Design a protein around this ligand. Structure first.
Ligand code: X3S
Length: 346
């Protein structure tokens, strides 16, 4: 008789529509807790994400509102699409949580990165990330925070990006992962679409090396790892930095940088047959063109899709699609609560 029922999944209580049965924990990040469930109405398995009090603070509220609005806009096989959105609370006064429902995937890209992948699967996963980023860019969305935990895949190698990136203080224990951010984000520099190509390079490099390329406690250690491996950037890049940051960057020790065959040796690639030897040199070539500090010299998404390691998956039906407003204002808890509540109640 009650439209909703509640079940305990670890430390989180999930109050969901009775169509969703056999809820089980699968993962969790920071914005919310996630469960697998059987949807008895659609006769299919789904993933349910709980957003607890999204209006509680500016950081939570801006992301919750933006991702609800943008999700209804974008329509791409490599970008998340919601099956349902609901709240168990009946009024704005009582409104507390938002539940988002999507197709159930099998793993996040962090799990995939740990496995040895042949060139067929590695290049197909990179092709799909580039198709998804291309669709985001066509909709006027430049991501800037693409990372493995926000990318999901199924057993058949299909892939979907879960979030829309950057729009600051948080009193929670969870710290954000900054290892995939481009130099232009690390150094507050101004950016174009190919800021996301740096993140694809970091992901690709980690798939090969099975270790994060540019780790660090904060941007200080992270920038050191970038220059130690790729080398000190050109003076043309140095002239585009803001004066205070430019002084910091030009006063670090000078690094020549390691060659891409040295950063990614043949030992890390399946290099047995002539077919695989060519694919490994093509994979290194693409890494060489994405992991470029200066965005004026870094490869674009469209040119990355045309790279010989990627273009073996090209097809006009999914590379291109028909494109389609613009929100970014500060609000009180009450105003954010009503903006998110109105979006949940279409
Ligand atoms: C990372 C893993 S692991 C795994 C698994 O164990 N599958 C086996 C097969 O039966 C159990 C499934 C997934 N998976 C995660 C999502 N979605 C979100 O993380 N967020 C998310 C959401 F849920 C709902 C809406 C929005 C967002 Cl953004 C989808 N699939």
């Amino acid at each position: 008789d009650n439209q909703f029922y509640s079940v305990e999944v670890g430390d989180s209580t999930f109050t969901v529509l009775k169509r969703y049965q056999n809820l089980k924990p699968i993962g969790s990040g920071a914005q919310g807790i996630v469960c697998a469930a059987y949807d008895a109405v659609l006769d299919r398995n789904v993933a349910i994400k709980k957003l607890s009090r999204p209006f509680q603070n500016q950081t939570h509220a801006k992301r919750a509102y933006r991702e609800l609005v943008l999700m209804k806009c974008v329509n791409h096989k490599n970008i998340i699409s919601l099956l349902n959105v609901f709240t168990p609370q009946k009024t704005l006064e009582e409104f507390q949580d938002v539940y988002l429902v999507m197709e159930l995937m099998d793993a996040n890209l962090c799990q995939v990165i740990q496995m040895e992948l042949d060139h067929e699967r590695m290049s197909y996963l990179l092709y799909q990330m580039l198709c998804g980023i291309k669709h985001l860019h066509s909709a006027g969305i430049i991501h800037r925070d693409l990372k493995p935990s926000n990318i999901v895949v199924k057993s058949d190698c299909t892939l979907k990006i879960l979030d829309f990136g950057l729009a600051s203080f948080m009193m929670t224990p969870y710290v954000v992962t900054r290892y995939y951010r481009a130099p232009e984000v690390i150094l507050g520099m101004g950016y174009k679409e190919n800021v996301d190509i740096w993140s694809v390079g970091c992901i690709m490099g980690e798939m090969v090396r099975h270790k994060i390329l540019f780790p660090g406690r904060d941007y200080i250690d992270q920038w050191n790892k970038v220059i130690e491996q790729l080398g000190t950037p050109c003076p043309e890049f140095m002239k585009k930095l803001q004066p205070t940051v430019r002084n910091y960057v030009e006063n670090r020790p000078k690094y020549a940088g390691l060659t891409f065959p040295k950063l990614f040796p043949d030992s890390l690639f399946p290099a047995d047959s002539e077919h695989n030897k060519l694919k490994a040199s093509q994979a290194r070539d693409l890494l060489s063109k994405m992991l470029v500090i200066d965005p004026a010299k870094r490869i674009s998404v469209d040119d990355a899709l045309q790279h010989p390691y990627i273009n073996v998956w090209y097809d006009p039906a999914e590379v291109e699609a028909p494109p389609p407003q613009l929100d970014e204002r500060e609000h009180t808890i009450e105003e954010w609560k009503e903006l998110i509540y109105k979006e949940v109640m279409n």
